[PDB]
C-alpha cells in the first residue's frame, strides 16, 4: 500500500526543483 | 541579522490522523533521528551549507 | 501523513496526532545588518569621552 | 555566565505509563499552558524573579 | 504520573508515554564572567 504524504511548498523545507520539467515523481521536490 | 534569544518556544511535528497505526513508528523515528544527529545535520545543510 | 513545518498547537492536537518536535523554534528579532554609518560632523571628539 | 547558543535541542516531558488514561489530557494540558504563557511565566518566576 | 525534569529520550519513550515538552533546552557553554589611577604610565616600564 502506497502512502500519500501531504506537504506545503515552503523553503527550505520543500521547494520546487529548478529542473522539475525534466523530472517526474518525487524527484520534483527537494528541501528539508 | 537575527539578534537576541527566542522570545518563546514552539515546535514542528510530523502530523498523523487520529487512530492511525503509523503514529507510534513515526514518533519513534523522530526521537531516533534527533539522538543520532540526523535532524541537526539536515538543519545545517539547508540553512548554512546551502 | 503530513511531513511539513506544521506548528504543534492545542487545537490541532485535538483533531490530529502530532509527533515529538523534530526541530524547536520560537519568535526572534530581525534587524538590518549594521553597516558603517556616515561619520558625524563633530566626530573628531570621539577618541576622548565627553 | 552562560555564553553562546544551544548546541542541540532536547525537551522535558511529563511521563505517564503506557495505556494510562492520563495520557491525552496531560498532553493537551501541557499544550494549553504553553500557549497561554503559564509555562513561560513559571520558568521566569523560578529562574529570574527568584 | 511523573512531573519532573525528565529528558525525552528514545529508550524512555518506548516504555512510557511522553507528553509534549514543557521545557526546551540544550547543551550550553559555561564560562567565568577597572583601570588603575596611575595607569597612564603603562606604556613604559617603571
Task: Identify the three-state secondary structure at position C1.
Answer: coil
Q: In angstroms, what CA-CA distances link D10 with A24, C24, C43?
A: 38, 9, 49
C29/B30 CB distance under 8 A: no
CB E26 within 8 A of CB E8: no
Closest CA to C3 of D17, B32, E46, A14: A14
Q: CA Rg, chain A, in Å?
A: 10
- The three-point CA angle C44-C45-C49 to 5° equals 155
HEC letters along B22-39: CHHHHHHHHHHHHHCCHH
- Rounded Cα distance, D32 and D27, in Å: 9
What residues does E30 pair with on adjacent strands? D2
What the block records as the C-alpha cell of E7 is 529528558
CB D8 within 8 A of CB E27: yes
Residues sharing a CB contact under 8 Å with residue B16, sequence separation 6 or more, in sequence order: B22, B23, B26, C1, C2, C16, C17, C18, C19
Where b means 16+ CB within 10 Å and e means fewer, A8-32 reads eeeeebbeeeeeeeeeeeeeeeebb
Strands B10-17 and C2-7: antiparallel
> Experimentally, how was this structure solved?
cryo-EM
- Annotated binding residue at C5? yes
What the block records as the C-alpha cell of A22 is 525534466
- Rounded Cα distance, D15 and E1, in Å: 6
CB E17 within 8 A of CB D17: yes
Chain A residues whose C-beta sits inside 8 Å of any chain C C-beta: 3-8, 10, 13-14, 32
Best of A7, A11, A32 to disrupt the B interface by mutation (most B CBs within 10 Å)? Answer: A32
What residues does B17 pair with on adjacent strands? C16
Amino acid at each position: 500500500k502506497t502512502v500519500v504524504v501531504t506537504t506545503i511548498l515552503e523553503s527550505p523545507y520543500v521547494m520546487m526543483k529548478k529542473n522539475h520539467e525534466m523530472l517526474e515523481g518525487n524527484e520534483r521536490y527537494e528541501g528539508y | 541579522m537575527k539578534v537576541g534569544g527566542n522570545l518563546d518556544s514552539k515546535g514542528y511535528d510530523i502530523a498523523t490522523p487520529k487512530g492511525s497505526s503509523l503514529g507510534t513508528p513515526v514518533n519513534l523515528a523522530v526521537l531516533k533521528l534527533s539522538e543520532q544527529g540526523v535532524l541537526d545535520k539536515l538543519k545545517n545543510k539547508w540553512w548554512y551549507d546551502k | 501523513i503530513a511531513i511539513a513545518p506544521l506548528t504543534i498547537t492545542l487545537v490541532r492536537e485535538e483533531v490530529i496526532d502530532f509527533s515529538k518536535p523534530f526541530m524547536s523554534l520560537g519568535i526572534s528579532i530581525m534587524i538590518k545588518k549594521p553597516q558603517k554609518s556616515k561619520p558625524g560632523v563633530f566626530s573628531f571628539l570621539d577618541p576622548l569621552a565627553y
